[PDB]
Structure 1
Amino acid sequence: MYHNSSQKRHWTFSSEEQLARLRADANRKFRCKAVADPVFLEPHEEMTLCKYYEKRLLEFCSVFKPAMPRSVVGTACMYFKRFYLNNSVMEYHPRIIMLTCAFLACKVDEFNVSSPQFVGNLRPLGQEKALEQILEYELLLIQQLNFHLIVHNPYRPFEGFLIDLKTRYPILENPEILRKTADDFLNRIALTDAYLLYTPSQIALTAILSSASRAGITMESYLSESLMLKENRTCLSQLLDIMKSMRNLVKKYEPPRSEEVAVLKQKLERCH
C-alpha cells in the first residue's frame, strides 16, 4: 500500500528545488568524473532531452503489442524519472534507458512477454544489438532505483474516487462525464514532475476536481462533507493548497521544441 511503501519513504520530495539540486549534483558529478569545454550539457538541456525521451517512451508503449496495461506504462515512466534524478544523460543514453525501463516495468508488473516480442516491437540485427544493450543496462537501472520497484500509479485511486462519487455524491448526477477531461489532465500531470512531489491519490483528486471545474460543477461539499473535512479546516486548506500547486505546476510546463531538441540530440550524440 502507498501509505507505507518505498515510494512515499524515499521517492516523494519536498519541493521542486530538491529535484533541481539533485539533477545539478548529478551533472556536476559527471563533469568532475569526466574532467579527471562546450561538449558538456547544462542541466536544463538535460531536462529538455529527458522530456523528449519520456515522450518517445510514451509513444513506444502506445505502439507496443501485445497491448500494454496502463500500470506498465506508468511504472516505466516513473522509472525513467527516478533514474534521471541522480544520473546524467551524458553518462547513459536515454534511448537505451527508456527501453530498459519498459523491459523492467514489464517484468515487475507481471506483463509476461518474451524478449523476442519486445525487440520485435522495435522498428533484426539492430533488434539484437538493442536487446544486448537492454541486458547490459537492466541491472544498472535496478541498482539506480535502490531496489525499489513497486510504483504506485493514480489510475486505481482515480477509479476508487469515481466509485465514491457515484455512491455518496448524489448532487453530481453522473460522475462518468468527468472521465475524458479528467484523464487528459491526468496525462498532462504525468508529463510534469508531480509524480515525484505528490501522492497518487492527491493527483487523482486534483484531476477529478479540475475536470469538474472545466464542466462548471463545484464539489467543495464533497471534500467538506462527504470526505469529513469539516472536522479539520486546516487539512482542507492543506489539500486545497496541494491541488492549487499541482494545477500551477501543470500550467507552467514547457513542452520541448523541435529545433532546440534537434540541437540537443546533436550535442548528446557528440558526447557519446
Structure 2
Amino acid sequence: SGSFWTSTQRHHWQYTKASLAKERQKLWLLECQLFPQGLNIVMDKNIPITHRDLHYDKDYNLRIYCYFLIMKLGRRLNIRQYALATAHIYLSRFLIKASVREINLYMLVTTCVYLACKVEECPQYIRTLVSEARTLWPEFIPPDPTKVTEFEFYLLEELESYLIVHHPYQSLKQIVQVLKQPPFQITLSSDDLQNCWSLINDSYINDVHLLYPPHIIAVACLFITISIHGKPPKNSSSPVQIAFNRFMAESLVDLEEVMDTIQEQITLYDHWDKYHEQWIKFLLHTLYLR
C-alpha cells in the first residue's frame, strides 16, 4: 500500500466490465477453432459430448474448487495469506488470457504459489514445494521440478511483468485505524473483525478484483459484516451502525460499485450451494488422465 493511484494496477490491468467481456469473447473465439469435438466422458459404453459451453468454461463451477485447492496447498505448506492472495490474482490473470482445457491446473496452482511466494518476499524452495505438491496430489505432477519452472517461465511471460499488487487488507487496517477517531469513536469486536477478514479472504473468487480499487472491496466486506452484526422499537438502532452509515455517506467513497460488490458476494454465496466436488473432479480426471 504505497500508492494505488498512479501504480501499475490502476493503469495496465484492472479494466472495466465491457473490456473484460470483450477480452472473454476474444478468448472464446480463440478456443472456438481449437477443439469443436468436446469431451469424451465415460462412467457407467457411456459417451455423450457437451456443447462448447455447457460447462468447464470460466463461468463459475470450478472457481470455488480452484480457491479451495489453492488454500489447501497454502495451509499444507503453511505460508501466510498475502502469498495465496497474490497467487489467486496470478491465477485469474492467467486464466483470463488462456483456456483451462489445455493447461494442467495443479501445476498452474503450484506455479502461482511459487511465483507469489518468491515475489512477495517469503520464499519457498522448489524441493519442498514440489514434494508437497506430490504428497497431496500423487498424480497430475511430474517429479521433475524443471517442468514446474518452465511453467514459471511461461507464467512470467503471460502476465507481462506486473507482479506486485495492492491488497484490501492494508486498506482494511487503515479504515479500522480511522474509525478510532472523535468523529466516530467505534471499534468492532475481534470476532467480527475476523468475519470481515474472512469475507475479504473469500472475495478473491467471483472476478471483482480486476474491476474496482481494493478499498471499495474492503468497505463492502466491512459493511456486510457490520450490518449483519448490528441487528442480531427503532429501525436503525445499535449506533455502531449509525456511525458506520455516517462514515460511508460523509466520506465520498462512491456507491454503485459497493452495490455491485455486495450483489456479487450474494451471488457467490448463492452459487456455493449448487457446487459438488464429484463432477468437477471427475471432469479433470477425464480431461487429463484419459
TM-score relative to the length of structure 1: 0.83
Gaps of 5+ in 1: 230-235
Question: 3-state SS of the aligned residue for 2:256?
Answer: helix
- Is the CA contact 1:53–1:95 (under 8 Å) kept in the aligned structure 2? no
Aligned position for 1:147: 161
Question: 3-state SS of the aligned residue for 2:99?
Answer: coil
Aligned position for 2:26: 25
Aligned position for 2:38: 38
Aligned position for 1:269: 288
Aligned position for 1:106: 117
Aligned position for 2:73: 60
The total of aligned residue pairs comes to 257
Deviations 1:145-199 (A, max 9, x none): 0111012111111111111112345442546454022122212322221111211
The yes-or-no answer on 1:8 pairing with 2:21 is no
Measure the CA separation in 1 of the matches of 2:149 and 2:90. Answer: 16
After TM superposition, give the deviation of residue 52 of structure 1 in Å: 1.9
Could you tell me which amino acid in structure 1 is paired with residue 266 of structure 2? K
**Segment of structure 1 superposing worse, 85-94 or 182-191:** 182-191
Aligned position for 1:121: 132
Moved >6 Å (runs of 4+): 125-128
- Is the CA contact 2:114–2:124 (under 8 Å) kept in the aligned structure 1? no
The yes-or-no answer on 1:251 pairing with 2:266 is yes
Partner of residue 193 from structure 2, selected from 179, 194, 210: 179
- Is the CA contact 2:63–2:206 (under 8 Å) kept in the aligned structure 1? no
Cα distance change on mapping 1:259 and 1:115 into 2, 3 Å: closer
Partner of residue 215 from structure 2, selected from 201, 204, 211: 201
1:68-107 matched pairs, under 5 angstroms: 68-107=79-118
Output the aligned Cα RMSD.
2.7
Aligned position for 2:249: 224
Could you tell me which amino acid in structure 1 is paired with residue 281 of structure 2? A
Measure the CA separation in 1 of the matches of 2:162 and 2:127. Answer: 26
Deviations 1:73-120 (A, max 9, x none): 110000000000010012212111111111110111011222222223
Measure the CA separation in 1 of the matches of 2:64 and 2:199. Answer: 17
Which has a greater percent of helix?
A: 1
Aligned position for 1:260: 279
After TM superposition, give the deviation of residue 210 of structure 1 in Å: 1.4
Could you tell me which amino acid in structure 1 is paired with residue 9 of structure 2? Q
